[PDB]
């Protein structure tokens with residue numbers, strides 16, 4: 001089939017969503033694309049180049065709150081941005097894994113620059129605005145990775161018996177699987193945002 | 208070589224640290240252990256069972272602040288615990304990946320129960336104490352995964368040219384690679400802990 005960048009990425013995303021990050025092999029991508037391996041290598045050099053492109057395209061497709069609205073508070077922007085990032089990551093199996101360790105792509109420069117500027121315009125030093133943005137990113141990636149991997153593990157083997165659990169852990173387990181992770185994520189997200197606020201408003205006051 | 212559980216895990220950890228989570232294959236573990244594959248399968252059924260055991264043992268070896276000190280504040284306990292968790296995860300290549308989606312093991316029940324109880328004794332509802340503990344865990348796992356994957360990506364291919372970067376992003380990149388991620392992690396960690404505190408102390412007050 002077509003091997004423009006768009007369609008290679010399309011197929012890799014499909015493959016990703018079907019078989020997870022382990023399924024993204026040269027061989028399996030070539031088979032999905034209906035091609036021989038040397039054909040694929042002309043287009044895609046290695047798994048890393050593919051993973052980097054997927055990380056970019058997952059956000060291009062499904063990360064729909066990447067810039068602050070007019071007059072938006074930094075708090076509200078981090079909240080909306082985090083929700084959007086999470087949704088984009090959850091779209092595809094192992095999409096959080098695919099993002100890990102990437103650095104913004106040239107295609108994302110204007111966006112991330114605007115994010116960083118926006119933070120600074122709201123009183124954060126570049127460093128502290130970056131640490132806030134990093135923390136939101138890290139938290140969200142962790143939350144998503146734990147949710148997606150847990151679902152994958154369920155499919156492999158069952159949890160161990162309930163009746164040997166201590167009681168708080170037993171409740172906690174009910175709670176965690178009472179949903180897909182959203183409630184815990186949103187609660188943690190508010191904690192994070194408020195802690196950034198405490199740090200910021202403190203200025204040079206001990207806090 | 209020896210194929211008690213301890214030594215299987217030892218070898219898998221070595222292999223993990225040498226070749227990362229992709230290197231943990233039946234075949235490569237059997238080769239490290241000096242055995243044929245059917246010998247290994249007697250001991251280790253599948254990659255998941257192995258990954259689960261590694262997640263447990265990485266914390267048994269190197270997670271040395273799992274319980275609160277006498278009279279310790281919940282804040283200080285989450286801080287020390289998070290630092291320790293991070294250190295344990297960073298010990299082995301892809302050790303954060305190995306943890307993802309796991310649930311506490313029977314061997315960890317008394318510890319995690321104590322953690323949950325401790326939170327509740329400090330005024331958190333079980334749910335809110337769990338959300339705090341989850342958030343700390345998620346943040347730490349994200350931070351560690353991004354640090355370790357970034358190091359792995361460096362080895363594969365170089366970052367793109369500096370001179371097309373916008374300036375805040377260029378600075379931010381200097382900052383992020385000014386260290387291994389510790390400074391950003393510690394800063395984010397304080398934000399998280401303080402946000403939990405704001406949430407807790409608020410009681411039924413709008414906050």
Ligand SMILES: Cc1c2c(c(O)c3c(O)cccc13)C(=O)[C@]1(O)C(=O)C(C(N)=O)=C(O)[C@@H](N(C)C)[C@@H]1C2
Nearest residue numbers: 066081085102103104108111112133136137379380
């Ligand atoms: C500013 C920044 C960001 C990201 C990032 O990885 C990063 C970096 O690795 C070094 C220095 C700066 C940044 C994000 O991944 C990203 O997810 C992202 O690319 C991004 C985006 N492209 O829209 C975001 O929305 C941001 N957000 C989840 C907090 C965050 C922004």
Ligand SMILES: Cc1c2c(c(O)c3c(O)cccc13)C(=O)[C@]1(O)C(=O)C(C(N)=O)=C(O)[C@@H](N(C)C)[C@@H]1C2
Nearest residue numbers: 172173273288292309310311315318319340343344
């Ligand atoms: C309480 C709890 C925890 C963990 C966890 O995964 C979990 C769960 O998946 C469901 C319900 C409860 C928990 C941790 O992984 C763990 O890392 C952990 O096992 C753990 C430990 N075994 O010592 C910790 O130190 C904890 N910490 C990093 C906040 C955290 C505690």
Ligand SMILES: [Cl-]
Nearest residue numbers: 001002003004
């Ligand atoms: Cl083509």
Ligand SMILES: [Cl-]
Nearest residue numbers: 004005006007
């Ligand atoms: Cl294209």
Ligand SMILES: [Cl-]
Nearest residue numbers: 071072073076
């Ligand atoms: Cl607003």
Ligand SMILES: [Cl-]
Nearest residue numbers: 074197200201
């Ligand atoms: Cl503010």
Ligand SMILES: [Cl-]
Nearest residue numbers: 208209210211
């Ligand atoms: Cl033996």
Ligand SMILES: [Cl-]
Nearest residue numbers: 211212213214
């Ligand atoms: Cl043993």
Ligand SMILES: [Cl-]
Nearest residue numbers: 278279280283
């Ligand atoms: Cl204390």
Ligand SMILES: [Cl-]
Nearest residue numbers: 281404407408
């Ligand atoms: Cl308190």
Ligand SMILES: [Mg+2]
Nearest residue numbers: 099102103137
């Ligand atoms: Mg990123």
Ligand SMILES: [Mg+2]
Nearest residue numbers: 306309310344
């Ligand atoms: Mg865990």
